């Protein structure tokens, strides 16, 4: 993380589409280095669903400038997650903060 | 006007790592010459032990992932570089790690022999998340001096090592940082004598009574080429 | 505010400290500015230019 | 050339119509092969690796 | 070591060396032991060191 | 613990009072350690003898200019400081000068004790203009260590001096300017090693290479209770 930022590090990491953000809120059920399984909260469910969202992170791939792209998870096993949080920091992100 | 010679007078342990050693007495000039010729050697070359090769089964290279662990295997290699061991009898050992079950994999879970002793058992290596998932690795520890990168070791070998034996960069030196202070010594008649308080900070794989003896053995060996041979 | 924040963590108000030399062991005459700067790397590496 | 024709009659070396034009790593590069993909045309028998 | 544009030198020293030469040739007032007399320049390095 | 040791000495000797030594190869970072541990000992810990207190009859201060002499009373002390003196057995020898007539006073014109030697006797001390304008001075030689100026003596010595006793700056250490560099030298496979170039100029009383041994044995004897 940068020690002296401008508070705009939070908006650029989320909106760039390089992190994995939660659509619905709930409790994290299982964390791997590749996938993240999240159990949806009760009121944020739809009446014909099973209520599990599965995020599949993308491991070591190739960018256009021949650099790395790698998404590591940042949550732990069994902790609550609200809507719009950051579940997986990408290449230059750090707890949802841009960090070059 | 003949001289006065110092002596290793006091050693105290602030913590398991932090130490503070004093030398007394010194003359005027030598209090600031030995205090700088003992920092420039204790930071550069001191023999310690470090992790060199890690071999986790089922995994080919260091740029993949294993099931049921939180980190990538490259993060496990970055965690295994900061491991403070102490090998006494031999000069190279192989340690085994076995773990199965939900929870972290601390450094205390390594089935050690009688000679090696992991001095910081609260270290964190991995994180297991599934019940069926497990991990198993063999870890080679050598003895060295200075900093030896991975490209030098892969360039200076010729036998074919099998696919899977990952290489870790090795930082061998135990001393992290070191400062020294020179205060007025407490001598009753020779008033202007000095004392030298070397303030050492390391990890738990060195002894401050031994580090100054090594760092002065080296200095009395390098000056042996100046005292007789011209 | 920077001087009101530096006095919280027991640091000099001027921001400059008295550095000692590494080689010779003497100390410099003036105080020297020491702190933290967020350094980046850049894509113009030397392995792709030689 | 005639002197090479003499050399290949002194010894029995007769290199065939085969000729090496393989793929090599460009110089000043270390690394680790982490992925290999093989595409093949229709109607062509695949290898063992493919 | 001379420019073809004009007779001025082109190996004129740049910023850091000229700052060192400016700092070396100055004078304070008290300055820790002024007014003493010396033999040569070789006993002025021994006093500074 | 292998610790590569140098065997290339190659003493280029420019003059009989000015040598130039080189050492190669050393470990990466062992150049400045030995090159600074020897500089801080030779400059301010080498013992030796020098003129420290002089007394002339006719003057009593640092500015009362004597008469019949060519130079003033301040230029005599700079000439007296550069006097290469060694002793044999004693510690405090009082020396007395006598020269009359018109002519330059040269440092060989002094009655010597049996144990006191003067290295460069062609040293000029003064210059006399008039005929029957003589000179006489009481020169005190002591034994000390390093460099002591005239400020720290008269600042702390509250005791009153015998009036007429001028305080001369002392140079007890028998080495003049020492400087050193560190250049990069190589072995057949390693390349980050380094050579060390020790340049030394001195006065008499000491072979310019022997001062390096005399400082190295002082530093090596200091580390006896650590090995």
Swiss-Prot record, chain A:
Acetylated on several lysine residues in the presence of glucose. This is DNA-directed RNA polymerase subunit beta. Belongs to the RNA polymerase beta chain family. The chain holds residues 697 to 796 of 1342 of the full protein. DNA-dependent RNA polymerase (RNAP) catalyzes the transcription of DNA into RNA using the four ribonucleoside triphosphates as substrates. Resistance to the antibiotics salinamide A, salinamide B, rifampicin, streptolydigin, CBR703, myxopyronin, and lipiarmycin can result from mutations in this protein. Co-administration of salinamide and rifampicin or salinamide and myxopyronin suppresses the emergence of resistance to both antibiotics. It comes from the Bacteria. The lineage of its organism: Bacteria, Pseudomonadati, Pseudomonadota, Gammaproteobacteria, Enterobacterales. The RNAP catalytic core consists of 2 alpha, 1 beta, 1 beta' and 1 omega subunit. When a sigma factor is associated with the core the holoenzyme is formed, which can initiate transcription. The rRNA transcription and antitermination complex (rrnTAC) consists of RNAP, NusA, NusB, NusE (rpsJ), NusG, SubB, ribosomal protein S4, DNA and precursor rRNA; S4 is more flexible than other subunits. In pull-down experiments interacts with CedA.
Curated annotation (Swiss-Prot), chain B:
Changing residue 186 to C: In rpoA101; temperature-sensitive. It catalyses: RNA(n) + a ribonucleoside 5'-triphosphate = RNA(n+1) + diphosphate. The keyword Transcription applies. Residues 1-230 are annotated as: Alpha N-terminal domain (alpha-NTD). Its EC number is 2.7.7.6. Belongs to the RNA polymerase alpha chain family. The N-terminal domain is essential for RNAP assembly and basal transcription, whereas the C-terminal domain is involved in interaction with transcriptional regulators (such as CRP) and with upstream promoter elements. This is DNA-directed RNA polymerase subunit alpha. It comes from Escherichia coli (strain K12). The gene is rpoA.
From Swiss-Prot, chain C:
Co-administration of salinamide and rifampicin or salinamide and myxopyronin suppresses the emergence of resistance to both antibiotics. The modification N6-acetyllysine is found at residue 7. Acetylated on several lysine residues in the presence of glucose. It comes from the Bacteria. Belongs to the RNA polymerase beta chain family. The RNAP catalytic core consists of 2 alpha, 1 beta, 1 beta' and 1 omega subunit. When a sigma factor is associated with the core the holoenzyme is formed, which can initiate transcription. The rRNA transcription and antitermination complex (rrnTAC) consists of RNAP, NusA, NusB, NusE (rpsJ), NusG, SubB, ribosomal protein S4, DNA and precursor rRNA; S4 is more flexible than other subunits. In pull-down experiments interacts with CedA. (Microbial infection) Interacts (via flap domain) with Escherichia phage lambda antitermination protein Q; this interaction renders bacterial RNAP resistant to transcription pausing and allows it to read through termination signals. DNA-dependent RNA polymerase (RNAP) catalyzes the transcription of DNA into RNA using the four ribonucleoside triphosphates as substrates. This is DNA-directed RNA polymerase subunit beta. The gene is rpoB. The chain holds residues 1194 to 1243 of 1342 of the full protein.
Curated annotation (Swiss-Prot), chain F:
Coiled coil: none annotated. GO terms for biological process: bacterial-type flagellum assembly; bacterial-type flagellum-dependent cell motility; cell motility; cellular response to cell envelope stress; DNA-templated transcription initiation; intracellular iron ion homeostasis; nitrate assimilation; regulation of DNA-templated transcription elongation. Residues 1-227 are annotated as: Alpha N-terminal domain (alpha-NTD). One of its GO terms (cellular component) is cytoplasm. The gene is rpoA. Disulfide bonds: none annotated. (Microbial infection) ADP-ribosylated on both alpha subunits by the phage T4 protein ModA. ADP-ribosylated on only one of the alpha subunits by the phage T4 protein Alt. It comes from the Bacteria. Residues 157-160 are annotated as: Required for interaction with Crp at class II promoters. DNA-dependent RNA polymerase (RNAP) catalyzes the transcription of DNA into RNA using the four ribonucleoside triphosphates as substrates. This subunit plays an important role in subunit assembly since its dimerization is the first step in the sequential assembly of subunits to form the holoenzyme. Part of the processive rRNA transcription and antitermination complex (rrnTAC). The complex forms an RNA-chaperone ring around the RNA exit tunnel of RNAP. It supports rapid transcription and antitermination of rRNA operons, cotranscriptional rRNA folding, and annealing of distal rRNA regions to allow correct ribosome biogenesis. Belongs to the RNA polymerase alpha chain family. Signal peptide: none annotated. Its EC number is 2.7.7.6. The chain holds residues 6 to 232 of 329 of the full protein. The keyword Acetylation applies. It is an enzyme of class 2 (transferase). The keyword Transport does not apply.
